[PDB]
Amino acid sequence: KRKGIILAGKQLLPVYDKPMIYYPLSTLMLAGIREILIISTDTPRFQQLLGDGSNWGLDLQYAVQDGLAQAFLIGESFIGNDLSALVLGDNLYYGHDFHELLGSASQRQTGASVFAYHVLDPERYGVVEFDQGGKAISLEEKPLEPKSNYAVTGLYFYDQQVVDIARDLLEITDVNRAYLERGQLSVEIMGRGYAWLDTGTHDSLLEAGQFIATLENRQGLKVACPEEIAYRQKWIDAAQLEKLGYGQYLKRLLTETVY
Amino acid sequence: KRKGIILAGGHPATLAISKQLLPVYDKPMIYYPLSTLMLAGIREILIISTPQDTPRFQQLLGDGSNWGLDLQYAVQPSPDGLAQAFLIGESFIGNDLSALVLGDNLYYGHDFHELLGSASQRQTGASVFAYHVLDPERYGVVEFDQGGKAISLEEKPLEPKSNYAVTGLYFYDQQVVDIARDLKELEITDVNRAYLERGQLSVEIMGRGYAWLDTGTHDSLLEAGQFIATLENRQGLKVACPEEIAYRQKWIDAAQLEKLAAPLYGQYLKRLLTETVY
Amino acid sequence: KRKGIILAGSKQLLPVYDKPMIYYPLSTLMLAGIREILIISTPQDTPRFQQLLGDGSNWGLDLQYAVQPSPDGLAQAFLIGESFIGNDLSALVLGDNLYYGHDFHELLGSASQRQTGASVFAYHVLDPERYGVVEFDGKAISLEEKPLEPKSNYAVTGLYFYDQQVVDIARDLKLEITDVNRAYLERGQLSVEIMGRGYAWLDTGTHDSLLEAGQFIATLENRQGLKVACPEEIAYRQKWIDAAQLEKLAAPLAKNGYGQYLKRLLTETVY
Amino acid sequence: RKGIILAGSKQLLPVYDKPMIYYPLSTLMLAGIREILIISTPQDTPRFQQLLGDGSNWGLDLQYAVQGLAQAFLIGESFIGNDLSALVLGDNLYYGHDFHELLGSASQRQTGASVFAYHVLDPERYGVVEFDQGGKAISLEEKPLEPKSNYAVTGLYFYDQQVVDIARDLEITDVNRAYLERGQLSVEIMGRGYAWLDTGTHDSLLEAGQFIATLENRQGLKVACPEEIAYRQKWIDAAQLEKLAAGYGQYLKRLLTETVY
Ligand SMILES: CNCCCNc1c(N(C)S(=O)(=O)c2ccccc2)c(=O)[nH]c(=O)n1Cc1ccc(Br)cc1
Ligand SMILES: CNCCCNc1c(N(C)S(=O)(=O)c2ccccc2)c(=O)[nH]c(=O)n1Cc1ccc(Br)cc1
Ligand SMILES: CNCCCNc1c(N(C)S(=O)(=O)c2ccccc2)c(=O)[nH]c(=O)n1Cc1ccc(Br)cc1
Ligand SMILES: CNCCCNc1c(N(C)S(=O)(=O)c2ccccc2)c(=O)[nH]c(=O)n1Cc1ccc(Br)cc1
Ligand SMILES: [Cl-]
Ligand SMILES: [Cl-]
Ligand SMILES: [Cl-]
Ligand SMILES: [Cl-]
Ligand SMILES: [Cl-]
Ligand SMILES: [Cl-]
Ligand SMILES: [Cl-]
Ligand SMILES: [Cl-]
């Protein structure tokens, strides 16, 4: 059992054709996570949008929020004794093998898993330094002189240790460094063939919109449609999808094989 | 040995410069299919184009020895079909395995090196890629049975059997030249159907996680440009930079990259010498 | 008579969305009523423009061609085109500039109809250091070529209207267009008209701006069902070519959206 | 002249750097209108109230009412009273040189109605206006199957004291035809040099966003910033702009210390 947390501290704005929250929600769903806590300021508006999630075969809970690590304190009782995963509300991911990348991370039963991605702008993120042999040797939160161009993405997989590490503090980078110092941090490369886009500024929200529109209008498939992912995980049956351009798309999913 | 062919066929936007010489954002369109053949490990490449455009590719790309490639050039007298590439490049292909790419196609995704590697390493039959599109009527369409086996190909069908379009990327064994010779426009789809009829066609799915973009219209060239710019300005890495791929294949050494970087894109090539990229 | 010069120092043969970049500055000179135009470019690019545009008689224009041996400055255009200009009023446009807005015919008309001094356009930009910057007291008091500390955010556009003085001013320079314009300013014969924020003046000179310019034109054109800076349209509306000539020009492009567009111009009133 | 914005949520979505409602709001403000009624759904009316307030921060008087497009004159009948009126739709964006003067001219007629005709690829989606050989408007059709022209009537309407009673007796096109039938409809051409964009679909909202970003990042000026328009109309002084300003804040500060023509 692994439980999910989305921290939305903007995430109700659409990226092209659906609310921004649908991307991190879809990401946790693709990783096989069904029990998800949405932490925000906005909490009632997410409740109004997403409900308890039983329409999508999910169990959605809500909590209200001083730092990203604070999510483990707020969701401590939600996490209980289970493995956890944390996603940030303003990140979207796209690529081939993304189901498998998440699967591998979510299936480790010990330590923590994070993803390093080559960016132009590493100073804006957690930066991970590698030695000559490609081993992760240091983490720095928004460094003035980055040790590498490899930014840690807003996607984190944690074992039962995280709550107690967070308690002894609030930077997510300190949590991740505590695992690294114990030799229990897995840093997987997210290859340049994957797209990890910021949706956090006026410019990047626009770029992300154009990016999704180009893929979707080319393929005739949607990126990060939660009802599709639910259906393909077999968390909802054809009857439930039937009940649930977006409506037309869901109908098409019942009458087409997509590989 | 597998040998590569890039077919760059043929207003008023393109009256001063053929389509595959137009830039997609920051580099000439030909750099994408060129980079694709290079990523598949192909170094000996024939560029077929119009009598007018062949000299301009020669002027842009040279013999390719700067990038550790062997580039040759041939002309297509008139646009009498895509299969005509095997007739024109028959002597270039000889008795070797071959690969055909179309000049106006752009590919991007994780495991693309591995997808190409697998196809290029088969020593028999033909390998093509099926991609889910909104607009299947514009392409070769591949129909699948309940067990996911390919059962038919149709060139630009009025009523497509599926949404799975065959991409502009083709891997062929020694049979292709003789199959092409016996065809009666000469369609690549007829070549592929001849393999399918012999049970020697491998149709690999190119997953929705890969981007296969058209660069063939004013609208799609613009979309493709915005797509590459977004990735490149996010990553600080280039898509389909031939000098990078050459360097990473170890077809050129750091000394050769330095020389190529000096006169120029140039700043980017210099950065490649002083950074580990996984 | 006012004679036009397009300096394209290749970039101006690249398309902005649906037509070659040169069609924008060409259309701009045409909208200003200029029919006799000299296209100055490199020895390599001059033949390619000749191949694209011809003598221009298809569009009721008289196009001539000259070469710039090496890129020794923008003012060099008046030395190269000295004989082409002769004793006539002149206009200079740069090959990588795109203009769009309401009253652009009237803005150009007014400038082209002055029979004395020089007329330039000041446009509020985020990035003034990249251009000639004009300082105001609303009277223009100074010009600086790509200043490190700009006196204002008002950039001088790539669009210049000159009287018979320009050739002799250019002859005595040591070669910046800004020095030419300052020589007029020093004589109190420089007219600096504001190009309002309601007009779009876009750079097409980098990978990023060429893309932005492309998206900009596509959005207008697909919204309106009208083209921006289509030379055959402007020629037809100036009555430099008749319906018969437009029909002939449309026929061979019949295949595509551009031929179809020219045919539509014969059977529709557009205000 | 009193203004009505009908926003029938979509008009709270941003076009690049500001809420969509800021464009039609800025349009009424540029036309010199300070008293504006925002009509929306029972659900969205409170959200506009929360965003915009009574508008006194921007030297405006903003009122709110809840909800065909002609129904706006019935709902805002008491708001309009005996005054001239102007109606804008919540999902339309306008840009061009002389837009202050185009609006000024329309807003300054003291009789009949003024609308704007714009050449579009897609006339069937709008009110279509037909012209005779002499450029006179001879007919209006609401979303015709066979459009008589490519000239769409924009979401921008100027009305005299007659409109409430015409509406009482529900398509905006019928209201406009009633004026046309009385020979009291002025149809001004909005030239191709102006941009009139739809922000009503996923595709057009994206296009509109890219369009505004390109202009704004080129000029270092904002399109349809209400605080700027208020300041330039002298409805608020430098002191009030300073308070409101305390990238968008930085922009308002810049407006106090720069001459912009
Ligand atoms: C062929 N396997 C790869 C799946 C394609 N991958 C899918 C993606 N991606 C393109 S993704 O993976 O990059 C992604 C997922 C969530 C958010 C953002 C991106 C998607 O958006 N939706 C979808 O249904 N699948 C198929 C799918 C989903 C779940 C199951 Br279970 C099975 C299929
Ligand atoms: C093995 N790392 C994953 C590959 C990343 N893949 C790379 C891509 N891609 C994003 S791609 O593969 O999608 C692609 C390649 C050619 C044309 C179009 C797309 C690219 O453009 N350039 C590059 O150098 N590589 C690394 C690379 C190249 C060659 C070698 Br050999 C090793 C690395
Ligand atoms: C009728 N006055 C409005 C002009 C609309 N203006 C036009 C523009 N503009 C949008 S523009 O003016 O901004 C412009 C012109 C050239 C290059 C770049 C922009 C245009 O591109 N094409 C066109 O035919 N006209 C009509 C037209 C042209 C010439 C004559 Br003569 C008559 C009509
Ligand atoms: C010559 N100046 C006319 C307007 C310039 N143009 C302005 C525009 N435009 C670009 S616009 O006019 O196309 C427009 C306005 C509102 C909504 C949509 C578009 C604008 O957005 N804001 C602004 O302050 N002005 C100056 C300004 C405004 C008010 C006064 Br009063 C004075 C100056
Ligand atoms: Cl981190
Ligand atoms: Cl990769
Ligand atoms: Cl095929
Ligand atoms: Cl995939
Ligand atoms: Cl100057
Ligand atoms: Cl203006
Ligand atoms: Cl109407
Ligand atoms: Cl106009």
- Rg of chain D (C-alpha set): 18
> Peptide bond preceding B12: is omega within 30 degrees of 0, i.e. cis?
yes
Hey, whose CA ends up nearest to atom 8 of ligand 1?
Answer: A223
Is any ligand 4 atom within 6 A of the Cβ of residue D232? yes
For residue C105, give the ligand 3 atom closest to its CA.
12
- Tell me, in angstroms, the distance from the centre of ligand 1 to residue A99's CA: 7
Q: Closest Cα of chain C to D153: distance in Å?
A: 13
Burial class (CB in 10 A: 0-12, 13-18, 19+), B136: buried
* CB of C101 shorter than 6 A to ligand 3: yes
Count of beta carbons in the 10 Å neighbourhood of residue C174 = 5
CA distance C57 to C253: 18
CA dist C239 → C228, C245, D176 (Å): 18, 11, 36
Q: Which ligand neighbours the alpha carbon of C158 most closely?
A: 9
Q: Is D223 in the pocket of ligand 4 (CB under 6 A)?
A: yes
Residue D6 CA from chain centroid, whole number: 9
What is the whole-number distance in angstroms between the Cα of residue C46 and the centre of ligand 3?
A: 27
Q: Position of tokens 């890129």? A: C71
Q: How long is chain C?
A: 271
Resolution number, Å: 2.5
Cβ-based neighbours of B61, under 8 Å, separated by 6 or more? B30, B34, B47, B71
Tell me the H-state helices in chain C.
23-31, 46-53, 76-80, 82-85, 104-113, 166-171, 177-186, 207-224, 231-237, 243-253, 257-266
C-alpha of residue C181 to centroid of ligand 9, in Å? 6
Q: Beta strand pairing status for D113-119 and D151-159?
A: antiparallel
Strand partners, A198: A91
Which string of b and e fits C218-250 if b means at least 16 CB within 10 Å?
Answer: bbbbbbbbbbbbbbbbbbbeeebbeeebbeebb
**Burial degree of A137 (CB within 10 A; 0-12, 13-18, 19+):** exposed
D224 in contact with ligand 4, CB cutoff 6 A: yes
Helix ranges (H only) for chain A are 22-30, 43-50, 70-74, 76-79, 98-107, 162-167, 172-181, 202-219, 226-232, 238-243, 246-254
Cα–Cα distance, C10 to C89 (Å, whole number): 29
E strands, A52-200, are 59-64, 83-88, 91-94, 112-118, 126-130, 136-141, 150-158, 185-189, 195-198
Atom of ligand 4 nearest to the CA of C197: 10
B63 bridge partner residues? none
Determine whether the interchain pair A209/D209 forms a contact, defined as Cβ–Cβ distance below 8 Å: yes
Amino acid at B168: G
As for chain C, the residues directly before each break of C–N over 2.5 Å are 9, 137, 174
Determine the residue of A99, A153, A225 to mutate for testing ligand 1's pocket, defined as the one with the most ligand atoms within 8 A of the Cβ atom: A99
- Number of the ligand closest to the Cα of B152: 7
Residues in chain B: 278
Residue of A nearest to B233 (CA): A120
Ligand 3 atom with the smallest distance to the CA of C98 is: 18
Overall residue count recorded for chain A in this entry = 259
Separation of CA B219 from chain center: 21
CA nearest neighbour of B170 among B129, B140, B208, B122: B129
What is the C-alpha separation between B24 and B27, in angstroms, rounded? Answer: 6
Distance from CA of A95 to the nearest CA of B (A): 4
Pick B112's closest partner by Cβ from A149, A193, A195. A193
| Cross-strand bridge partners of residue D188 | D116
Going by C-beta distance under 8 Å and a sequence separation of 6 or more, which residues neighbour residue D76?
D4, D37, D39, D65, D85
CA atoms of C14 and D28, how far apart (whole Å) = 41
- Contact residues, chain C, for B17 at CB < 8 Å: 13-14
What three-state secondary structure class fits B259? Answer: helix
Helix axis angle for C207-224 and D202-219, nearest 10°, is: 130
Beta bridge partners of B126: B172, B201
Q: Which amino acid is at B204?
A: E
Angle at C62 between CA C56 and CA C66, to 5 degrees: 95
Residues with CB under 6 A from ligand 1: A 23, 26-27, 30, 93-95, 98-99, 223-224, 228-229, 232-233; B 207-209
Ligand 4 centroid – CA D229 distance (Å): 7
| Cross-chain residue pair B218–C14, CB shorter than 8 Å | no
Cβ atoms of residues A124 and A142 within 8 Å: yes
Closest by alpha carbon to B17, among C249, C67, C15, C211?
A: C15
Measured between alpha carbons, how far is residue D258 from residues A135, C134, C153, D218 in Å? 53, 14, 9, 17
What are the residues of chain A with a beta carbon less than 8 Å away from any beta carbon of chain B?
A: 94-98, 116-121, 130, 134, 149, 189, 191-198, 207, 210-211, 214-215, 217-221, 256-259
Q: What is the DSSP letter of D200?
A: S
**Residue of the nearest CA to atom 1 in ligand 1?**
A259
Nearest to B76 by CA among B67, B86, B68: B86
**DSSP state string for A227-244:** HHHHHHTTSS-HHHHHH-
Q: Could you give the C-alpha distances from D105 to B29, C228, D115, D197, in angstroms and in order?
A: 50, 27, 11, 22
List the helix and strand counts (H, then E) for chain D: 11, 13
Residues B275 and A149 sit within 8 Å (Cβ to Cβ): yes
Cα–chain center distance at B172:
14
Angle among Cα A125, A96, B152 to the nearest 5 degrees reads 160
> Angle at which helices A202-219 and B218-235 pack, to 10 degrees?
130
Beta carbons of B93 and B175 less than 8 angstroms apart: no
Report the 10 Å Cβ neighbour count for A68: 21
Picking from B32, B37, B35, the residue whose alpha carbon sits closest to that of residue B2 is: B37
DSSP labels for B165-206? EEEEEEEE-TTHHHHHHT-----HHHHHHHHHHTT-EEEEE-
Rounded to an integer, what is the distance from CA A210 to the centroid of its chain? 21
Cα gap C100→A18, rounded to integer Å: 34
The HSE-up count of residue A83 (CA atoms within 13 Å, CB side) is: 19
Is the shortest distance between the CB of D94 and ligand 4 below 6 Å?
yes
- For residue A177, which phi and psi values (nearest 5 degrees)? -65, -35
Instruction: Using alpha carbons, list the distances in angstroms from residue D164 to A157, B25, B223, D183.
Output: 63, 54, 47, 18
Burial label, D250 (beta-carbon count in 10 A; 0-12, 13-18, 19+): exposed
| SS3 at position B38 | helix
Helix (H, G, I), strand (E, B) or coil at C254: coil
Residue with tokens 């002609």: D70
Give the gap in angstroms from C-alpha C48 to the nearest C-alpha of chain B. 7
Q: Tokens representing D183? A: 């020979």
Residue of C nearest to B229 (CA): C208
Tell me the sheet residues that pair with D88. D5, D156
Beta strand C118-124 with C159-162 is: antiparallel
How far is the C-alpha of D223 from the C-alpha of D27, rounded, in Å? 10
Contact status, residue A191 vs residue B110, Cβ threshold 8 Å: yes
Task: At C201, give phi and psi (nearest 5°).
Answer: -115, 105
Tokens of residue A99, six digits: 């189901």
Residue where the block lists tokens 């065909």: D68
Residue among C39, C35, C25 at smallest CA distance from C2: C35
Beta bridge partners of D39: D6, D65
Q: Find the CB nearest A220 among B133, B209, B233.
A: B133
The number of C-alpha atoms within 13 Å of C59 and in the hemisphere containing its C-beta is 26
Method: X-ray
What would the two tokens of residue A238 be? Answer: 């054809």
Burial class (CB in 10 A: 0-12, 13-18, 19+), D1: buried
Q: Which of A16, A90, A229 to mutate to test the pocket of ligand 1 (most atoms within 8 A of CB)?
A: A229
In whole angstroms, what is the distance from residue B259 CA to residue B269 CA? 10
Q: Which two tokens stand for residue D72?
A: 């706006």
- For chain C, the maximum distance between any two Cα atoms, rounded to a whole number of angstroms, is 56
Of the ligands numbered here, which is closest to the C-alpha atom of B191? 7
CA-CA distance, B203 to B119, in Å (whole number)?
10
Residue type, C169: I
SS3 C202: strand
- Alpha helices in D121-181, H assignment, sequence order: 163-168, 172-181
Residue C20: strand pairing partners: C15
**3-class state of residue D217 by DSSP:** helix
Q: Which residues contact A226 (CB under 8 A, 6 or more apart)?
A: A22, A25, A26, A29, A56
Query: Per the structure block, which two tokens stand in for A114?
Result: 């994070």
Q: SS3 breakdown of chain B: % helix, strand, coil, rounded to 5? A: 35, 25, 40
B254-261 vs B266-273: helix crossing angle, rounded to 10: 160
Q: What is the DSSP letter of C240?
A: S
Query: Rounded to whole angstroms, what are the CA distances from D172 to D26, D81, D102, D164, D176?
Result: 22, 19, 21, 12, 6
Query: A22: CA distance to ligand 9 center in Å?
Result: 51
Ligand nearest to the CA of C199: 10
A134 touches A31 (CB < 8 A): no
Tell me how far apart the alpha carbons of residues A55 and A235 are, in angstroms, rounded to a whole number: 10
Element at D189 (helix H, strand E): strand D185-189
Residue A68 φ/ψ, nearest 5 degrees: -80, -35
Which residues, in sequence order, are CB contacts of D237 under 8 Å at separation 6+?
none
- Which token pair is A7? 């921290």
Are B68 and B48 in contact by the 8 Å Cβ rule? The answer is no
Which one, of D251, D250, D226, lies nearest residue D25 by Cα? D226
Residue partners of C175: CB distance under 8 A and separation at least 6: C72, C73, C74, C75, C76
For residue B212, the SS3 value is strand
Nearest CA to B265 out of B238, B229, B246 is that of: B238
Q: Chain D partners of C220 at a C-beta cutoff of 8 Å? A: 192, 195
Paired tokens of A206: 């626009």
Q: How far apart are CA C153 and CA C104, in angstroms?
A: 21
If you measure CA to CA, which chain C residue comes closest to D212? C216
Number of H helices, E strands in chain C: 11, 14
Q: How far apart are CA B96 and CA B1, in angstroms?
A: 6
Residue with tokens 């109809």: C113
User: Which two tokens mark A31?
Assistant: 């990783």
Closest CA to B3 of B87, B101, B75, B106: B101
Other C-beta atoms lying within 10 Å of the C-beta of residue A183 = 7
With residues binned 3-state (H G I as helix, E B as strand, rest as coil), the percentages for chain D, rounded to 5, are: 40, 25, 35
